[PDB]
Amino acid sequence: EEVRQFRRLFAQLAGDDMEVSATELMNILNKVVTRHPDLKTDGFGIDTCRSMVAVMDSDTTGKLGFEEFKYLWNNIKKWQAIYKQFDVDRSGTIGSSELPGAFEAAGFHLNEHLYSMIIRRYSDEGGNMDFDNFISCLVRLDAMFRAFKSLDKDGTGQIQVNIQEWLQLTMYS
Amino acid sequence: EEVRQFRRLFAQLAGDDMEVSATELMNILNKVVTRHPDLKTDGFGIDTCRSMVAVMDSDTTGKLGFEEFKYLWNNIKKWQAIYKQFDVDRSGTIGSSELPGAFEAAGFHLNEHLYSMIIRRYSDEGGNMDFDNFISCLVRLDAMFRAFKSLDKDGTGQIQVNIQEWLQLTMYS
Ligand SMILES: O=C(O)[C@@H](S)Cc1ccc(I)cc1
Ligand SMILES: O=C(O)[C@@H](S)Cc1ccc(I)cc1
Ligand SMILES: [Ca+2]
Ligand SMILES: [Ca+2]
Ligand SMILES: [Ca+2]
Ligand SMILES: [Ca+2]
Ligand SMILES: [Ca+2]
Ligand SMILES: [Ca+2]
Ligand SMILES: [Ca+2]
Ligand SMILES: [Ca+2]
């Protein structure tokens, strides 16, 4: 099976403490893109990884357990495919005009104002977003959408968040 | 004449487009920090500087103007001085025990839970925070506080926000 094969990757990656840290996450992700010449990236940095872990660590352990990691990995496997598909000019990167289509393929229908804000923060001078930036942007986007949805209990379209919660959601990410 | 000097710095740094981008910021920050052996750091990386710019960019130009860069620079000068004062064991990093007092001097009073989250996201195995992680964290904490006070112009300590608003507050930073 595949769940058999995954426990095997996980158990190997997680190591001694049965959890995968920011550092371990960084290594595996860097070990993989290496064999993907169609993905341009300057590498998955430690800071980006620590952010990926925090935003994915729903149980506040500082590291990712089996489920948390399983969620992250599956998403990443699906997202890398979208990136390749939408980089129609084989630049190895997602361009400004290539972005909306890719996010939509990943299930994120935003607006022109939001894509712009996104390009400004994650893309470079040129409007080109490389692979790590893309995955990084998507892990966060997914977490924030999830976070909003869980706080929208009445189904009203708006949430109420107090100072303590706010600081917890924005700082531990 | 304390600004005579500051205008010449920004102008020299900002360049042709009259704005300090993440890369311009990264360079200067890595240049100065080296002239201070009391601050241990693994370097200011591009993702972190990209984060710093995003959070200080109030005019949504994508870069730091004079007013934006000045507020940022002033804080760093101030936070740099706090870092050194509270690094009692002169390890060159802020430890778990050293943390709250340094934030207390910067003016933030957070609870233990929040501190645990911050240490998990910003410190190392031993629980020490280096210079870039310290500045990066503080630049964020300050921004997140200001963003919150700007929507709670009532003092209730709670904000109402829709999805479009939530994304801009959490994604553009
Ligand atoms: O290359 C792989 O391991 C396959 S299973 C898919 C994949 C591709 C790229 C990344 I980064 C992660 C996962
Ligand atoms: O402004 C400077 O170069 C010195 S005096 C203070 C300072 C020290 C470190 C940093 I990074 C920023 C500022
Ligand atoms: Ca581990
Ligand atoms: Ca966890
Ligand atoms: Ca492309
Ligand atoms: Ca990158
Ligand atoms: Ca410039
Ligand atoms: Ca600006
Ligand atoms: Ca110390
Ligand atoms: Ca660091």
Question: Which contiguous run of DSSP H or E holds residue A159?
Answer: strand A158-162
**Facing A162 at nearest CB: one of B47, B113, B157:** B157
First to last CA, chain A: 33
Count of domains for chain A: 1
Kindly tell me the sign of the dihedral angle through the C-alpha atoms of B72, B77, B83, B85. negative
Beta-carbon contacts of residue B91 (< 8 Å; ≥ 6 apart): B40, B128
The DSSP code for A64 is B
Q: H helices of chain B, where? A: 4-14, 22-32, 46-56, 66-86, 99-106, 112-122, 131-149, 163-171
Which residues line ion ligand 7, judged by CB < 5 Å? B 14-15, 17, 19
Q: Compute the distance between CA of residue A128 and CA of residue A131 in angstroms, rounded to an integer.
A: 10
- The CATH number linked to B60 is 1.10.238.10
Q: Which residues line ligand 1 (CB under 6 A)?
A: A 29, 32-33, 36, 76-77, 80
Resolution, given in Å to one decimal, reads 2.0
| Side chain identity, residue B63 | K
Chain B touched by A5 (CB under 8 Å): no
Surface-to-core class of residue B53, CB atoms within 10 Å of its CB (0-12 exposed, 13-18 middle, 19+ buried): buried
* CA distances from residue A29 to A22, A80, A131, A142 in whole angstroms, order as listed: 11, 12, 11, 19
Substitution target in B58, B121, B151, B164 with the highest count of A β-carbons within 10 Å is B121
> Is some CB atom of chain A closer than 8 A to the CB atom of B167?
yes
Which residue matches tokens 């607006």? Answer: A111
Name the experimental technique: X-ray
Range of the domain at A172: 1-173
